[PDB]
């Protein structure tokens, strides 16, 4: 359900992989959702959580590591973090997850 | 019985069987003209739905899956066709 | 997996007239079985068979007359020549005077008497007595 | 019937005899066709679009309200996705019964399920590459299978 | 083949009996020779106008084709200018009145007028020995679309 | 607007037909868009056996959905005006044949040109306000094949004097025994 809003917002919609460009949307204020997986360092993740709360963006946890949000969104690469940049056709943003 | 009509069975004969086993086979399934008590538009609904459908004003629920025919919402307004 | 819709239409008329019925029911009403079944007609061995056309294969109700012996189908469809119509006719029919053995033939389905009397000859699709 | 089981159920559904239906349908045919390509682009697949139209709207089928069925509504209108769905349900269910193996590995009835959905896989896959649907050289590999479901 | 190495052994390669003039110039500064292989065989275009030798070529070589026509399905085309076909057929038991499938494997010398490729199905003319193996040509390859069209990235 | 609404020269059998459609359109409100851009290809006249006559109309099949449209009023004010007629709304479905083993590869003939989808279209087209609801063949003893189409009891009260005159034109046109019934 959820791995299929996300598989919904690659093909559809906008969005950035990796930590650096996601603290860059976030820094730019044209991030909507951050979605971090669950095996990402703590500091990491207390960064990533101060920069969503400082820009007001929402915050969902990936229940998978960095492996799990790779495949989710459809890569063959471990993804840290997911920057959502616009939704397109699904609802990932009006669901709370 | 050694001899009897195939091609003419008995309206009743034909009711009580099987959808596909009956001399040409088609559904008993059918349609319902649905009015929610929110608004007045008529929906159409299946007999069998098998997915919560909804309505404009009240939707929540207008009937429920079930094994086979769907459950109108106990207070919704249907007529076939 | 239905392999010969003939040969399923040739077995429902047999149990039908050994038990003695007047009526039978034949899914699903191939082509091939509607020319047998024509041949059948006749040469009077079935009567009148109405097909009930459904969208997607029909259904074939076949009228007995308490006369036919024996429908059955050579299966596979061998190919026989000229010389072996008789050979075929001899060890499939009761008698030499009466019983069928029909062919495909490119002439059209039919008899094995007409068939010769044409001198056409195809495969074999069965027999009726 | 059961290609692998031993059931001989036959629990399927009878279309009607009608090919013009159901003579109360006031939308138009052009009108359901953006109500498909709506739920498409949604992500909804043929038979999911079938089954809301068939209960929210009184669509009893597509082919018979519009000329073509709802995969070739969706690959004239450009939405076809790169795999069928039944071959793509199949392959998400080895990959969710794999993702079961590794964590209970002495689960032999899984692994019995296991080979008996990658040979339909196979089966299928087969067909697909016959028919062209599929390119030829697509092997389902087990382990990249993943990726073609995301 | 036009290019692609047309001289690319130590022999100079050329038509036999076939002279180019270096006194006479003309616009073409290649002179080409070729014949019609006959029974209805369309002589390809690049037999015409190539530029390779092939003295095995049945339009533009030494090698004329007569006696048997057979028609087979190319299964390799790992050699030089030469492919097996598979030619299936069925053979009759007279006692089971019944046939059996069967196969025989062909080896046939091929022009580099004709792309041939693996599931192709070809025509070929007998000719003399060519090899060890080979006494045919292909005269025509017969593959219009090849179910090779909707096989590619969707969208 | 008399010839133009017919697309042929000949005949006058036809030319009256097109003339009585224009003074049909006193109608201003629904003449357009619903009767005005309509148009047919051809006239036959089949004698029923009763002693009366049908008309038998073509019309060129792209335009069935809109001109079906107009079709169950059209046939009031048409037989009032041309009484001792029974009008049947046709379409112009080209036939292709079969092709046979030394024949040249024409084009792969679709299934709607084949001669028994023709022939299906025929009397849908015929029986139009009524849904063909089933179809029977019998196969007589002596080698007849006759035709039954079932017919569906709702709306049978606009078509229930014209099955003679079905059945004429179809054995007219497709050469085909044909009868009709309707189940109760
Ligand atoms: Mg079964
Ligand atoms: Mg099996």
């Given at each position: 359900?959820?791995?299929?809003?996300?598989?919904?917002?690659?093909?559809?919609?906008?969005?950035?992989?990796?930590?650096?460009?996601?603290?860059?949307?976030?820094?730019?204020?044209?991030?909507?959702?951050?979605?971090?997986?669950?095996?990402?360092?703590?500091?990491?993740?207390?960064?990533?959580?101060?920069?969503?709360?400082?820009?007001?963006?929402?915050?969902?946890?990936?229940?998978?590591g960095?492996?799990?949000?790779?495949?989710?969104?459809?890569?063959?690469?471990?993804?840290?973090?997911?920057?959502?940049?616009?939704?397109?056709?699904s609802?990932?943003?009006?669901?709370?997850? | 019985?050694?001899?009897?009509?195939?091609?003419?069975?008995?309206?009743?004969?034909?009711?009580?069987?099987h959808?596909?086993?009956?001399?040409?086979?088609?559904?008993?399934?059918?349609?319902?003209?649905?009015?929610?008590?929110?608004?007045?538009?008529?929906?159409?609904?299946?007999?069998?739905?098998?997915?919560?459908?909804?309505?404009?004003?009240?939707?929540?629920?207008?009937?429920?899956?079930?094994?086979?025919?769907?459950?109108?919402?106990?207070?919704?307004?249907?007529?076939?066709? | 997996?239905?392999?010969?819709?003939?040969?399923?239409?040739?077995?429902?008329?047999n149990?039908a007239?050994?038990?003695?019925?007047?009526?039978?029911?034949?899914?699903?009403?191939?082509?091939?079985?509607?020319?047998?079944?024509?041949?059948?007609?006749?040469?009077?061995?079935?009567?009148?068979?109405?097909?009930?056309?459904?969208?997607?294969?029909?259904?074939?109700?076949?009228?007995?007359?308490?006369?036919?012996?024996?429908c059955?189908?050579?299966?596979?469809?061998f190919?026989?020549?000229?010389?072996?119509?008789?050979?075929?006719?001899?060890?499939?029919?009761?008698?030499?005077?009466?019983?069928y053995?029909?062919?495909?033939?490119?002439?059209?389905?039919?008899?094995?008497?007409?068939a010769?009397?044409?001198?056409?000859?195809?495969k074999?699709?069965?027999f009726?007595? | 019937?059961?290609?692998?089981?031993?059931?001989?159920?036959?629990?399927?559904?009878?279309?009607?005899?009608?090919?013009?239906?159901?003579?109360?349908?006031?939308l138009?045919?052009?009108?359901?066709?953006?109500?498909?390509?709506?739920?498409?682009?949604?992500?909804?697949?043929?038979?999911?679009?079938?089954?809301?139209?068939?209960?929210?709207?009184?669509?009893?089928?597509?082919?018979?309200?519009?000329?073509?069925?709802?995969?070739?509504?969706?690959?004239?209108?450009?939405?076809?996705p790169?795999?069928?769905?039944?071959?793509?349900?199949?392959?998400?269910?080895?990959?969710?019964?794999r993702?079961?193996?590794?964590?209970?590995?002495?689960?032999?009835?899984?692994?019995?399920?296991?080979?008996?959905?990658?040979?339909?896989?196979?089966?299928?896959?087969?067909?697909?590459?016959?028919?062209?649907?599929?390119?030829?050289?697509?092997?389902?590999?087990?382990?990249?299978?993943?990726?073609?479901?995301? | 083949?036009?290019?692609?190495?047309?001289?690319?052994?130590?022999?100079?390669?050329?038509?036999?009996?076939?002279?180019?003039?270096?006194?006479?110039?003309?616009?073409?500064?290649?002179?080409?020779?070729?014949?019609?292989?006959?029974?209805?065989?369309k002589?390809?275009?690049?037999?015409?106008?190539?530029?390779?030798?092939?003295?095995?070529?049945?339009?533009?070589?030494?090698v004329?084709?007569?006696?048997?026509?057979?028609?087979?399905?190319?299964?390799?085309?790992?050699?030089?200018?030469?492919?097996?076909?598979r030619?299936?057929?069925?053979?009759?038991?007279?006692?089971?009145?019944?046939?059996?499938?069967?196969?025989?494997?062909?080896?046939?010398?091929?022009?580099?007028?004709?792309?041939?490729?693996?599931?192709?199905?070809?025509?070929?003319?007998?000719?003399?020995?060519?090899?060890?193996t080979?006494?045919?040509?292909?005269?025509?390859?017969?593959?219009?679309?090849?179910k090779?069209?909707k096989?590619?990235?969707?969208? | 607007?008399?010839?133009?609404?017919?697309?042929?020269?000949?005949?006058?059998?036809?030319?009256?037909?097109?003339?009585?459609?224009?003074?049909?359109?006193?109608?201003?409100?629904?003449?357009?868009?619903?009767?005005?851009?309509?148009?047919?290809?051809?006239?036959?006249?089949?004698?029923?056996?009763?002693?009366?006559?049908?008309?038998?109309?073509?019309?060129?099949?792209?335009?069935?959905?809109?001109?079906?449209?107009?079709?169950?009023?059209?046939?009031?004010?048409?037989?009032?005006?041309?009484?001792?007629?029974?009008?049947?709304?046709?379409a112009?479905?080209?036939?292709?044949?079969?092709?046979?083993?030394?024949?040249?590869?024409?084009?792969?003939?679709?299934?709607?040109?084949?001669?028994?989808?023709?022939?299906?279209?025929?009397?849908?087209?015929?029986?139009?306000?009524?849904?063909?609801?089933?179809?029977?063949?019998?196969?007589?003893?002596?080698?007849?094949?006759?035709?039954?189409v079932?017919?569906?009891?709702k709306?049978?009260?606009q078509?229930?004097?014209?099955?003679?005159?079905?059945?004429?034109?179809?054995?007219?046109?497709?050469?085909?025994?044909?009868?009709?019934?309707?189940?109760?």
């Open positions: 359900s959820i791995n299929q809003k996300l598989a919904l917002v690659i093909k559809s919609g906008k969005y950035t992989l990796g930590y650096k460009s996601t603290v860059k949307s976030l820094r730019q204020g044209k991030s909507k959702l951050i979605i971090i997986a669950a095996n990402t360092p703590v500091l990491r993740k207390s960064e990533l959580e101060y920069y969503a709360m400082l820009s007001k963006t929402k915050v969902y946890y990936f229940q998978g960095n492996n799990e949000l790779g495949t989710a969104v459809g890569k063959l690469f471990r993804v840290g973090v997911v920057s959502i940049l616009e939704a397109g056709d609802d990932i943003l009006t669901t709370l997850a | 019985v050694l001899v009897q009509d195939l091609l003419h069975p008995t309206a009743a004969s034909e009711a009580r069987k959808k596909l086993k009956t001399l040409v086979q088609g559904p008993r399934s059918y349609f319902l003209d649905v009015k929610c008590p929110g608004c007045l538009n008529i929906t159409t609904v299946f007999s069998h739905a098998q997915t919560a459908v909804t309505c404009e004003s009240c939707s929540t629920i207008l009937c429920t899956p079930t094994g086979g025919k769907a459950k109108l919402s106990e207070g919704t307004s249907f007529r076939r066709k | 997996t239905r392999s010969s819709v003939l040969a399923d239409a040739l077995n429902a008329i149990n007239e050994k038990t003695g019925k007047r009526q039978v029911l034949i899914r699903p009403s191939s082509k091939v079985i509607i020319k047998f079944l024509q041949v059948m007609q006749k040469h009077g061995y079935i009567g009148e068979f109405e097909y009930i056309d459904d969208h997607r294969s029909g259904k074939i109700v076949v009228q007995l007359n308490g006369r036919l012996n024996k059955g189908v050579i299966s596979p469809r190919n026989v020549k000229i010389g072996d119509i008789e050979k075929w006719t001899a060890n499939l029919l009761p008698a030499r005077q009466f019983g053995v029909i062919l495909t033939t490119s002439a059209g389905i039919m008899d094995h008497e007409e010769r009397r044409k001198h056409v000859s195809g074999i699709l069965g009726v007595y | 019937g059961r290609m692998h089981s031993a059931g001989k159920g036959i629990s399927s559904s009878a279309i009607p005899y009608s090919r013009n239906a159901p003579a109360w349908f006031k138009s045919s052009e009108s359901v066709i953006e109500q498909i390509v709506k739920y498409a682009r949604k992500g909804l697949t043929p038979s999911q679009i079938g089954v809301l139209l068939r209960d929210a709207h009184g669509v009893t089928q597509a082919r018979v309200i519009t000329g073509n069925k709802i995969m070739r509504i969706l690959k004239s209108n450009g939405l076809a790169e795999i069928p769905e039944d071959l793509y349900y199949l392959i998400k269910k080895a990959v969710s019964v993702k079961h193996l590794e964590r209970n590995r002495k689960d032999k009835d899984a692994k019995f399920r296991l080979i008996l959905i990658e040979s339909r896989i196979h089966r299928l896959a087969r067909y697909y590459r016959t028919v062209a649907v599929l390119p030829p050289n697509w092997k389902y590999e087990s382990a990249t299978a993943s990726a073609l479901v995301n | 083949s036009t290019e692609l190495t047309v001289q690319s052994e130590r022999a100079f390669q050329k038509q036999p009996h076939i002279f180019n003039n270096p006194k006479v110039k003309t616009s073409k500064r290649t002179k080409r020779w070729y014949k019609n292989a006959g029974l209805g065989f002589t390809p275009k690049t037999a015409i106008e190539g530029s390779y030798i092939d003295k095995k070529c049945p339009f533009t070589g030494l004329s084709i007569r006696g048997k026509i057979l028609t087979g399905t190319v299964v390799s085309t790992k050699m030089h200018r030469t492919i097996v076909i030619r299936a057929y069925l053979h009759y038991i007279p006692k089971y009145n019944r046939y059996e499938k069967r196969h025989k494997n062909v080896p046939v010398h091929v022009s580099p007028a004709f792309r041939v490729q693996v599931g192709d199905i070809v025509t070929v003319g007998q000719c003399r020995p060519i090899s060890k080979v006494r045919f040509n292909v005269v025509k390859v017969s593959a219009a679309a090849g090779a069209n096989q590619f990235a969707k969208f | 607007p008399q010839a133009k609404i017919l697309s042929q020269a000949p005949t006058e059998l036809e030319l009256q037909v097109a003339q009585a459609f224009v003074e049909l359109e006193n109608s201003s409100p629904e003449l357009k868009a619903e009767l005005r851009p309509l148009q047919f290809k051809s006239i036959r006249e089949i004698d029923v056996a009763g002693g009366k006559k049908a008309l038998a109309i073509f019309v060129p099949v792209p335009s069935l959905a809109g001109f079906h449209k107009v079709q169950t009023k059209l046939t009031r004010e048409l037989e009032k005006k041309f009484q001792d007629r029974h009008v049947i709304f046709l112009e479905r080209r036939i292709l044949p079969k092709p046979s083993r030394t024949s040249r590869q024409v084009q792969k003939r679709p299934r709607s040109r084949t001669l028994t989808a023709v022939h299906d279209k025929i009397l849908e087209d015929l029986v139009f306000p009524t849904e063909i609801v089933g179809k029977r063949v019998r196969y007589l003893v002596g080698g007849n094949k006759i035709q039954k079932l017919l569906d009891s709306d049978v009260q078509i229930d004097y014209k099955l003679e005159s079905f059945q004429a034109v179809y054995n007219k046109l497709t050469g085909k025994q044909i009868v009709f019934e309707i189940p109760s």
